[PDB]
Amino acid sequence: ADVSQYHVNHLVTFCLGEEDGVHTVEDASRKLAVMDSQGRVWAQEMLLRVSPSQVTLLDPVSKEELESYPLDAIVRCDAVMPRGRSRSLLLLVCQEPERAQPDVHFFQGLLLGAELIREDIQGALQNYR
Template sequence: MSRPSSKAIYRKSSPPSPPLLPPAFTAPNFHTSLSPTDQRKNYALSVLKQQWDLRHYVEHLLTLHVDSKDIRNVDDCIMRLKMMEAQGRVWGQDMILEVKDHELLLSDIESKDELESFPLECVLRCTAVLDSCTYDSILAITVKDRSHEEISILLFQCTQSGVSCTGTATLCRLWGRATAKGTPGGLGDLLGWA
């Protein structure tokens, strides 16, 4: 029977390696010229961005342009939706609503083709309308077209199980706060965050 060499017995073990961070986590860089307050703010925004990616299955019900006569706000849009629903003139389209790269994207569920996109600074307001008609969880998104200066209100039924329309509206507002701060005419100005 052979004995192990003295080198094998007295070999120092290496210290345990530090735990790995999840791949999506990025540690803040404290070696910058930013003040500690700005560093904390940037870090908080990056964590919010990672945690609250907005991606939900919705049913697009209706898009109406705001004018000075019939359509002035979300309540007018809901009244129009009720009227059209009573006449059987609402044909919903299932789609994916997501916030990605500072844009609100609407994509086809099957083909994943982008149907429409809005820069977040053009999103003026997100409103949850619950139990107002046949549709029990409506998300109303008010957007401003940059090229024509028109304001439109898009109505969606939140269809994904376990996702509340109120939560989606809250996420839209948080994204608007994080991205439109200091952007003239954006959600930040509208709600007084700028």
């Protein structure tokens, strides 16, 4: 029942519209690959904080919240390894209240890794449920 924080690299955030073609995890990974080839992916260092009530994204430097997700807004969290890469990516799917559509977020887990963060967030999701 704690607060933890990890340094991750945010790769991309995109919406799941009703007409995009992103239906599976593999489609989400594919889109990241295409955006990368379009020069639309720039690894941004970020602090990812997991607490009993929310997951927060913060600026490592400023230290100010950039985004905050109550746990009930989180749809799923997975450690995913897309074909082509070798280090798992952290996949987070969320639905902010204020938003019409849910979003997909990909982060590189770095040294501690995507699986550990996924487990921490999943544990937080269960205890909240």
